[PDB]
Scaffold this motif. Sequence first.
Motif, short mmCIF file in Angstrom:
data_model
loop_
_atom_site.label_atom_id
_atom_site.label_comp_id
_atom_site.label_asym_id
_atom_site.label_seq_id
_atom_site.Cartn_x
_atom_site.Cartn_y
_atom_site.Cartn_z
N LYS A 50 66.90 -82.10 -35.37
CA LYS A 50 65.48 -81.77 -35.31
C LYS A 50 64.89 -81.61 -36.70
O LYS A 50 63.75 -82.02 -36.94
N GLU A 51 65.64 -81.01 -37.62
CA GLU A 51 65.14 -80.82 -38.98
C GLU A 51 64.96 -82.16 -39.69
O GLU A 51 64.00 -82.33 -40.45
N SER A 52 65.86 -83.11 -39.45
CA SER A 52 65.73 -84.42 -40.09
C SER A 52 64.43 -85.10 -39.68
O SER A 52 63.77 -85.72 -40.52
N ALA A 53 64.06 -84.99 -38.41
CA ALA A 53 62.79 -85.56 -37.96
C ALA A 53 61.61 -84.87 -38.63
O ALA A 53 60.65 -85.53 -39.02
N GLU A 54 61.67 -83.55 -38.77
CA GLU A 54 60.57 -82.82 -39.39
C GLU A 54 60.52 -83.07 -40.90
O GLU A 54 59.43 -83.17 -41.48
N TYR A 55 61.68 -83.18 -41.54
CA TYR A 55 61.71 -83.51 -42.96
C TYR A 55 61.13 -84.89 -43.21
O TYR A 55 60.38 -85.09 -44.17
N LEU A 56 61.47 -85.86 -42.36
CA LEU A 56 60.96 -87.22 -42.53
C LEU A 56 59.45 -87.26 -42.39
O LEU A 56 58.77 -87.95 -43.15
N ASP A 57 58.90 -86.54 -41.40
CA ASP A 57 57.46 -86.51 -41.23
C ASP A 57 56.78 -85.82 -42.40
O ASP A 57 55.70 -86.25 -42.84
N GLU A 58 57.38 -84.75 -42.92
CA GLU A 58 56.79 -84.03 -44.04
C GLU A 58 56.73 -84.90 -45.29
O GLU A 58 55.72 -84.90 -46.01
N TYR A 59 57.80 -85.65 -45.58
CA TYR A 59 57.80 -86.53 -46.74
C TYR A 59 56.74 -87.61 -46.61
O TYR A 59 56.05 -87.94 -47.58
N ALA A 60 56.61 -88.20 -45.42
CA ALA A 60 55.61 -89.23 -45.21
C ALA A 60 54.20 -88.67 -45.35
O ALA A 60 53.32 -89.33 -45.91
N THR A 61 53.97 -87.46 -44.85
CA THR A 61 52.67 -86.84 -44.99
C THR A 61 52.34 -86.57 -46.46
O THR A 61 51.23 -86.83 -46.91
N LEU A 62 53.32 -86.06 -47.22
CA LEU A 62 53.09 -85.78 -48.63
C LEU A 62 52.77 -87.05 -49.40
O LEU A 62 51.90 -87.04 -50.28
N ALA A 63 53.45 -88.15 -49.08
CA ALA A 63 53.21 -89.40 -49.79
C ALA A 63 51.78 -89.89 -49.59
O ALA A 63 51.15 -90.40 -50.52
N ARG A 64 51.25 -89.74 -48.37
CA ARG A 64 49.87 -90.15 -48.11
C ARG A 64 48.89 -89.28 -48.88
O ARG A 64 47.91 -89.79 -49.44
N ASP A 65 49.13 -87.97 -48.92
CA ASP A 65 48.22 -87.07 -49.62
C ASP A 65 48.22 -87.34 -51.12
O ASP A 65 47.18 -87.26 -51.78
N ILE A 66 49.39 -87.64 -51.69
CA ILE A 66 49.46 -87.97 -53.12
C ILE A 66 48.67 -89.24 -53.41
O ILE A 66 47.94 -89.31 -54.40
N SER A 67 48.82 -90.26 -52.56
CA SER A 67 48.10 -91.51 -52.77
C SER A 67 46.59 -91.30 -52.65
O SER A 67 45.82 -91.89 -53.42
N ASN A 68 46.16 -90.47 -51.70
CA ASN A 68 44.74 -90.18 -51.57
C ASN A 68 44.21 -89.44 -52.80
O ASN A 68 43.12 -89.75 -53.29
N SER A 69 44.97 -88.47 -53.30
CA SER A 69 44.51 -87.69 -54.44
C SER A 69 44.47 -88.54 -55.71
O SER A 69 43.58 -88.35 -56.55
N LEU A 70 45.41 -89.47 -55.86
CA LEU A 70 45.40 -90.33 -57.04
C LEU A 70 44.21 -91.27 -57.04
O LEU A 70 43.63 -91.56 -58.09
N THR A 71 43.83 -91.77 -55.86
CA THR A 71 42.64 -92.60 -55.76
C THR A 71 41.37 -91.81 -56.07
O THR A 71 40.45 -92.32 -56.71
N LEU A 72 41.32 -90.56 -55.61
CA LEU A 72 40.12 -89.74 -55.81
C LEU A 72 39.90 -89.43 -57.29
O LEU A 72 38.76 -89.45 -57.76
N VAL A 73 40.97 -89.13 -58.02
CA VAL A 73 40.83 -88.76 -59.43
C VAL A 73 40.30 -89.93 -60.25
O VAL A 73 39.42 -89.76 -61.10
N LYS A 74 40.82 -91.13 -60.01
CA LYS A 74 40.42 -92.29 -60.80
C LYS A 74 38.94 -92.60 -60.61
O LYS A 74 38.24 -92.92 -61.59
#
Lengths: 50, 50, 49, 201, 774
Positions: E491-515
């Motif tokens: 169960k933790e592996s599924a939640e860890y995988l979702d958390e990493y994918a969510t973080l990657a999207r937020d980082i990409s959104n924030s990098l686009t916003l700053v530029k």
Amino acid sequence: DVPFVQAYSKFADDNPRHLRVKTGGKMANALTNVIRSYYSINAPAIVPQV
Amino acid sequence: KLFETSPFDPLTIKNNQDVVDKLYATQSSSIQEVVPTKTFATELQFGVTS
Amino acid sequence: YRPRRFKEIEHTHGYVYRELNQGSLLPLVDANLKESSSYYFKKLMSSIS
Amino acid sequence: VGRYYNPFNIDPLTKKHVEDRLEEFINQVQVGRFRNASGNAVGTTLAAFLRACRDKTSANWRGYSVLVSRYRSLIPNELFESLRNISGEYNINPQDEHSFFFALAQINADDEFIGAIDKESAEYLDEYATLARDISNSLTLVKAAFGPLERTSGSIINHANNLNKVINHVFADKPLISETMLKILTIDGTTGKDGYRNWLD
Amino acid sequence: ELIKVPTIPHNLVLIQSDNGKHALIKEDLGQWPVETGISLVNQAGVFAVQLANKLGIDKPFVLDAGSNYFTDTSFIDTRKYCTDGLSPREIQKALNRQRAYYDRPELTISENKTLLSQSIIYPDADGNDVSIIFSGAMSHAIFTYAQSQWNKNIIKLDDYIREITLTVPKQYRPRRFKEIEHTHGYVYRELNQGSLLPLVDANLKESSSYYFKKLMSSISNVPVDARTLQSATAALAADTGQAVNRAQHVSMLTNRLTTANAPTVRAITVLTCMFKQFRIGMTYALDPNIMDVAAATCMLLFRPAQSISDEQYRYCLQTMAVFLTNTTYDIVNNDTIDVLKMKLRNQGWPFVERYNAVEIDMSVEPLRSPGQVGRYYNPFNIDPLTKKHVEDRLEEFINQVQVGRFRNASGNAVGTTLAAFLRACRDKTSANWRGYSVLVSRYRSLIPNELFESLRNISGEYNINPQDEHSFFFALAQINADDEFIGAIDKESAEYLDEYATLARDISNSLTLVKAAFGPLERTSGSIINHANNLNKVINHVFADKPLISETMLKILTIDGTTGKDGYRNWLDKLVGHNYPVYVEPVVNIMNFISARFVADSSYFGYTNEIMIMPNHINVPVDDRFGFRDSPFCTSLPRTIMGNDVRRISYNVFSMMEDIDDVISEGFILYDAYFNFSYDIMTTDGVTRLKEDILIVTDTGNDIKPIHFYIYFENRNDKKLRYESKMNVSYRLYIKTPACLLPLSDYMRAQHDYVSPSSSRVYIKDPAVVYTRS
């Protein structure tokens, strides 16, 4: 004139005033005389270390 | 307004001592470099009396 | 920048009284400000909340 | 045009503290042992304070940098030049300095600025032009009404103070003259009898 | 998941006059207000998203218009007649009305059949269905471009499996796909991997503390075998004679034993072997005892040398010298590691060296680490190949300690106590290292390689007490892998995988916003003030309504006690000027396309860059294609009128003009602004005019009132309307003819092709290839 007055103050350590010719302040005096000394050994060294 | 509380009212003073006394009274209003506390003494000699 | 036009009557028959003396702050500035600087600084901080 | 030091030793270009080894330095303190015989967890406690101070300063340096620029815009040029001659040293209690950085309040001035214009500062600075007109007009009016002054008896302080009262009586219709005259005397009179002499000069 | 669009979004409308003389086709894409004085590109970005929602292309989709067809009654005709787009019957009705006005005969049967068969569906070589329908040009261009962008992320199932084979662990049962899915299966997956380094590198203390806390909670619940301490204590008491009457060093070791904090220490043990550099700290008493020496010796022997810093290593050596060699902390304060090692070795103490743990490679590729090999340290410094400690002379060293004389010239009380204690720790670590090795490997699979090489114990929260360390190894508990515990990890592996994918999207959104939002800073008050205000405005907007960034990021940023808004504002600030590469996504490509067309083709969306005001007595060329009376549309704004170039005035100059009355008499062109306009096409005949007056004069400035054309069709032989146009209208406003208008005669220009994928394809929602063991 704000950008130019802003940069002249850093270069010449003085605020430009009307009716006074802008020459570069003490920095221009040092640079011009140091240039003469570099060219020839007969040119005097007149700029203090301070 | 130059001062929130005036350092001293000029009309009330009469000599140099009142200026010093008034400045001590109104020093709390100003931004003081050193806030006064009890004073510490390092030298004290008593002279013989009549 | 340019000023706005007044009424037509004021432009034809209008007169104004003006004074051209800007003055200087030097008489108030030219003094020993060591004692009064602290009181001035207290007022300066209170101007901006 | 003027210049001021950016608060908290933060370079706006790098958006960080001037010292480029700060993170390495704080980690060095965390693992260090200082008073092994007579102290406990000095390095860890000091290190935790340093990270808190570093984070707060990097978080709130823009607010304090804007605040300094706002205060500098209120002082007219003539006053600033005279203030250059004076000097001072401020004594801060060690408890207050640490408390200032440990609990560093966030300063936001977004509502104060309409674009790039600060209405309150601009209107405050414009009032000094009105004060300049009053100073010059009051000085000329007193000079013509009283002319050269003589002191046959009495002290300098009494001579200047009583002259101000007579100015009030003569110019009771225009109260601005006495108020402006007393404004100069208040600043001059702080020195004492020497300042009163400068006012008469 | 993927959306199947049933109908093609054509935007065509048919407008015809009452008499039928004139008919036109218009594409209605809406009207969008445009503001002057600010960047048009930024405004076009806001409208692109709204336009995409109107067309239904914002979210991933595949067209499913293949089945929208019918077959004619004729036996020869086997074609499939499309029902999408503008109906060919509507054009036929409009065309017949036009012929009735001109008294031409109606369309023949042959002409009707050709017109009615224009919209068709035919199959292509690859099995896809192509639909030829009447539709707008920009609707066709935008819709088809969005199709090609979403199709980049649609791949066959077998291609997806081949890309994820290296990450599949051995302990999972393979999934049996149906035969149809192997042949015709497709998955919509975005396979680009976004780095988490921008979040980790900027905020190292917050990121490390969050993941360590989450990992610690999981490891703390691992079941362990319940073994009593009586057997271990009894052996120790026998080896080093323990008397109730006498006071001995062995008692100080025994009374201090405690297993209360055992679950916490064993989670620290996993953390040291799971990360590359996880450094732990240890603080001993002011006056060292035999417990501190035993605890310090255990740390150097059974913990990785990577976990012990040089300063901690020196501190451990200093504690031993104070107790064993009878010296003070002040004397050994200035001595180096080499000097301290000589002092202890001369006295007979050999445990003065750190030992490097042996790395073990993971069987599979770590998650989010494509083409990389994982590693982790074997617990307790035991070489897996030899199944014993790295130090081969440990047996000899323990014997040397036993005969050594420490703290007393006569007797071996201290040496025997430490030797007996150290033998017990060696035996427990030899028996129970395999269970901890399996535990470490399981938790290593949760973290990527980036987190493995970046996270550090900066704060120093996880520090082991000396009483807990020596009790840990003396009373080491075997790890029992219960079935309940195993399922919890899955169960933790599924939640860890979702958390990493969510973080990657937020980082990409924030990098686009700053530029896009922030530029570079300068050493000036104006730049600092401008940056501070803009930063606050962006933060207020991103957190309004539904926040742009997820709750997972906010948890990492708020781990230090700061607010979510404050934490995000600091992180965005550090990102200014980043060189991090950002992969361009299909939705970003789609929006940039619509933004480009919004700027390029302004007449489609209701605004123009130039308008012309001219007196009625001046005759200007106009667009006569549509039959409008007094058409306000020109094919192009004329360069010359009556042999002289038309004067052009910018809107700013015209606003400040005080001689506007003299200028309007001649006529001029207004530019340097965006003019929003609207028009209504009425089927009847009437005077074509504007809703409001052209211009408004104020003491402050001149302005142009909102533009709304009332356009009527023209009957030439109407004296009343001809006279009203010339005499009741003094000035006229001209704009370039909108490109959305198209005459009915050119109805073949509305034909466009749409391709829909094959109907044999089946889309798989869950493309994972393994099952849980139980």
